[PDB]
Symmetry: C2
Subunit: 395 residues, 2 copies
């Protein structure tokens, strides 16, 4: 049997295999038509975005995301339309020779740009994405699947209709097939399992979204080759070591880090406060940990302004872990390609941690850092060898 997400991903692969062979004039042309269709329907899009903003205001939405949601504030919409033209006007990203090497007489190797394949784009609260990604995908010869959050449902619906319709309407003229771009109108998380068909995930949102995607997928994530890296600060963590090791994981960077803290580790809060007011690090705490951290600070009078604003470059999450076994369990839920560290003076715990974790690399009392959207990440490479009958048996 074929699931909904499987069929979506399969159709994307089929669409991409046609899209990759369509001329630049055909791929650029559909972008001009789409620009025109979006402009001609601006008023309908604006009304749908108006429903979205007002719905978000009346429910729980943070004034930051709310400002990202407004497509018609200032000249946001006009810039988005302009970006479609800018992209359509670029030189063909595909079929460019990056490297040519004469291997032997009449035997030449080329490295040629080619589409990545199929893109899954997951965004939250920024409707501009639909236009930017549709443009970049068709231009670069990639099929795309787009999934937005609840906040833009109305704007997403209207824009999807216009792109779907325009692609259908101009297929015979442009060559660009229906399905080149599929805009998923909440019909699932099974898409992240389709790594036989999907080549790249492009996340457009918060750090929390990236972390969630990383843990639920084997498809490469644009800009994030590594999984979440954890430091477990054990009950018997040395505090000086715990402070230096944990700070060093910041001052080295585009990486996703979790601090796993044993509550029985004495002065564990001095470690978080040392990260904030010495490394300028923002700490994304779980509710129960933040409530415990703030109480210890307020009891000491040390709950300064500089802590309150930086407790919710580098990510850094922090949560409790009440034993070595619990730290292991937490670590073993992360999608692989991550390193992990334990800070402890207890050898029985260190050895248990190192035997227990699913990790490429594991550190005991040493820093994990000892381990050595545009068209950018949307084109890959194909090698082509063009000879005249040469075989691997030459003298």
């Amino acid at each position: 049997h074929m699931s909904s997400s499987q069929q979506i991903a399969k159709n994307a692969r089929k669409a991409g295999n046609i899209l990759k062979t369509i001329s630049n004039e055909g791929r650029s042309d559909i972008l001009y038509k789409i620009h025109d269709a979006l402009k001609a329907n601006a008023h309908a899009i604006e009304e749908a975005n108006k429903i979205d903003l007002a719905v978000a205001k009346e429910t729980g939405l943070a004034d930051s995301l709310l400002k990202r949601l407004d497509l018609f504030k200032g000249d946001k919409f006009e810039v988005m339309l302009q970006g479609i033209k800018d992209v359509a006007e670029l030189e063909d990203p595909v079929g460019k020779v990056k490297m040519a090497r004469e291997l032997d007489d009449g035997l030449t190797l080329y490295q040629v740009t080619a589409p990545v394949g199929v893109l899954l784009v997951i965004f939250e609260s920024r409707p501009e994405v639909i236009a930017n990604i549709t443009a970049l995908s068709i231009k670069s010869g990639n099929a795309a699947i787009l999934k937005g959050g609840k906040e833009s449902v109305n704007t997403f619906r209207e824009m999807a209709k216009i792109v779907n319709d325009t692609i259908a309407q101009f297929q015979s003229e442009t060559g660009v097939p229906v399905g080149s771009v599929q805009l998923i109108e909440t019909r699932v998380s099974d898409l992240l399992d389709q790594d036989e068909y999907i080549d790249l995930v492009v996340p457009r949102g918060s750090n929390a979204l990236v972390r969630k995607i990383k843990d639920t997928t084997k498809i490469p994530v644009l800009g994030h080759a590594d999984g979440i890296c954890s430091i477990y600060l054990d009950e018997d963590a040395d505090l000086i070591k715990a402070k230096r090791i944990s700070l060093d994981a910041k001052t080295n960077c585009n990486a996703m880090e979790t601090l796993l803290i044993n509550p029985k580790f004495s002065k564990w809060w001095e470690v978080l406060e040392n990260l904030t007011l010495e490394g300028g690090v923002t700490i994304h705490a779980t509710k129960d940990l933040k409530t415990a951290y703030f109480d210890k600070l307020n009891e000491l009078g040390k709950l300064t302004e500089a802590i309150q604003c930086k407790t919710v470059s580098l990510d850094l999450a922090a949560k409790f872990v009440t034993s070595t076994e619990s730290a292991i369990q937490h670590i073993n839920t992360h999608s692989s390609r991550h390193t992990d560290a334990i800070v402890t003076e207890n050898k029985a715990n260190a050895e248990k941690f190192m035997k227990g974790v699913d990790s490429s690399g594991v550190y005991w009392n040493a820093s994990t850092r000892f381990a050595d959207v545009g068209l950018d990440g949307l084109v890959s490479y194909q090698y082509q060898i063009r000879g005249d009958g040469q075989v691997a048996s030459d003298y």
Copy 2:
């Protein structure tokens, strides 16, 4: 929702995460108990294998696989039992230090053997596998999932019962958890999609089985990093080039190759006959191609003995492809990490092929070879750094 195969794979991952931390005495001990249980139940296993042999004889089964099916011929069963002991007697494969490097004073790096993780073992018609793989898996700290073919259903059933029961019976004594080995009694091909949980596929059967597995999975396959590589011999293939290029793909090897032949390519049979009686290559033909190949040979009187036996090291399949577009379609159904070649003098076709294929590397009139069970492949490596508070900021 969680599918049957997802739950199987998830439980395997959970089992493996416990199994990896059980002592060698515990892992070796369960192997001795399993050896004893299989020996004590030999007569029951023999009766079940008797049903299997007689069922296979009365239906369509090839005397080759039939001979693999007989567990009690000669001393096959006694050797299998002996192999369990041999494995239980080996030195712990896990926790061995392969490499130690002093990175700095009191900062040392180790490369330590560790389990691969979860193994999916798919075999056809060889019941010995159940014992060998169960032994190697538990010994090396890997959880295993076993799926056999229809031919051994009875022997598989009886043996599964004995292993399941023994693992359950001795869990509190050995530490080795229920689920360390799951023997799937036809309850699916969805397991090959579980690459978030399954780390390695171990195929134990024919080349056709390997090819099928390779095309239906993103999980690495033991002994087969590369996908199926195709050579398309176009209508306008030069015959001298077609012969040399295609022969060279043999005389270079453990690889899976398909020859895609255009029927309108003149003397295309001379290419297959050149592979057989010059490279000693066996050709695994589709029915319609073999029937066409034999007729052209019989019409020329050239259907020798040496062709008939070698038409059904290197695999080499052969099938028809009636255009460049059809060759492309065929190639694009293969799971990635493969190179592909077109042999043609037609440039429009060559360029279409190179633009159309999903391939790392593509060759036009040049040979694809220009691209540069024991405990062996069941242990991977973990790096461990053991310091005393050292951070990535040293002078």
